[PDB]
Amino acid sequence: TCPFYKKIPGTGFTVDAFQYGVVEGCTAYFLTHFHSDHYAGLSKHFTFPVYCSEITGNLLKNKLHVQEQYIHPLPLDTECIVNGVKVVLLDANHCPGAVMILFYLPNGTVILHTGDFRADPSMERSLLADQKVHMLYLDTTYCSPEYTFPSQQEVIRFAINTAFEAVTLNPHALVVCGTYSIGKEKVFLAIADVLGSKVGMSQEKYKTLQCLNIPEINSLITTDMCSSLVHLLPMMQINFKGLQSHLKKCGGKYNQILAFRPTGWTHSNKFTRIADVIPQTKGNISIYGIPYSEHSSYLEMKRFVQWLKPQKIIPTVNVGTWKSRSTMEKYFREWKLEAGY
Ligand code: NI
C-alpha cells in the first residue's frame, strides 16, 4: 500500500510510486529520476501513463524496456496540461534527467515536489519566483546540522589535481573510478579530460551513458579498455582485492592504481577539510573517498526553505522512525521562527 507522502491530493497523481501494484484512483504516475529506490516496480509489462523528463524516458525505454506508448516525456521550464491539471518540471540539480514537479491544483493550491535535489541559489530565479507555494514535499536526506560537505566545484578541483599529479609522476599508473547508478559523471569526465584520455567501461555502463544527452559524449567515453587510462568499475569492486584483480587483467600495462569512491557524506566530514583528505594505501594501490554529494547540505536546504516560505512541509526521506520525524519537525519550526513566516 502506497504511503500518503507519495500521493498528490486533489489529483489522480502519484510520485515515485511503482512498487505498490495498481494504486486506486491513479491516472498518471510521475517519475522524478532514474534511481532504483524511485523506479522500483517498473518493467516492460507496465501499462499506465508515466510522466518524466526526456532523459528519464530514454532510460525507461532502453534500460527497463518500458514500451514507448506509455512513456510521456515533458520539456523543462514549460507549462503543460496533464489530465486537466497544469504542471511544470524544473531541474533538480541531482543526477541527469532529475526533476522537481510544480502542481497547480484546480482549487488554487500550489504544491512543489522536490524529488531528490541539491538546493542552489539559482533556483530562486527559476519559475518558482513567480507565485506562492502552499505545500512542499521535501528531500530531507541530510536534514541535520552535522551534515556538512564542500561544493561540487571544490571536490572536482581536488580530484583533477590529485590524478594529474600522480600520473605525471608515474606514466604507468591507472586511474579507476567506482559507480553503481547514474549521477556524479563529472568525477570521471573531469579526470579523463585532464589526462587526455577517454573513459573506458563495460558495454552495460556505456549503454546507460548513451541515454543522457551529454554534449560530445562520443568524444569522451569508450568500451575499448585497452585504449583508456581512466577505467570505470562497479562500486563493489573499489577495495584492495577487487583492484589487485583488475590490475592483473591489464597485461602489465600498469604498475600502480589510484582509485576514487565518490560517497555522499561520511563522518570524516565532521573533522577534516577537503584539502587535508588522504587515501587508504596497500602496496601499489591507493583509494580516495571523496564527498561528492548530489543532495542538499543542511545549510543549502535551510536557505531554500527560508526563501520559499511554504505553509506546510512533508518530508520524503528519513520518515521511518519517530526520532527522525521529531528531529525534522523541530528544525522546520526553528526555520519558520527565525525568518518570520
Ligand atoms: Ni536519487
Curated annotation (Swiss-Prot):
<comment type="subunit">
    <text>Binds constitutively to TP53BP1. Binds CDC27, which is itself a component of the anaphase promoting complex (APC). Binds PIAS1.</text>
</comment>
<comment type="similarity">
    <text>Belongs to the DNA repair metallo-beta-lactamase (DRMBL) family.</text>
</comment>
<comment type="function">
    <text>May be required for DNA interstrand cross-link repair. Also required for checkpoint mediated cell cycle arrest in early prophase in response to mitotic spindle poisons. Possesses beta-lactamase activity, catalyzing the hydrolysis of penicillin G and nitrocefin. Exhibits no activity towards other beta-lactam antibiotic classes including cephalosporins (cefotaxime) and carbapenems (imipenem).</text>
</comment>
<protein>
    <recommendedName>
        <fullName>DNA cross-link repair 1A protein</fullName>
    </recommendedName>
</protein>
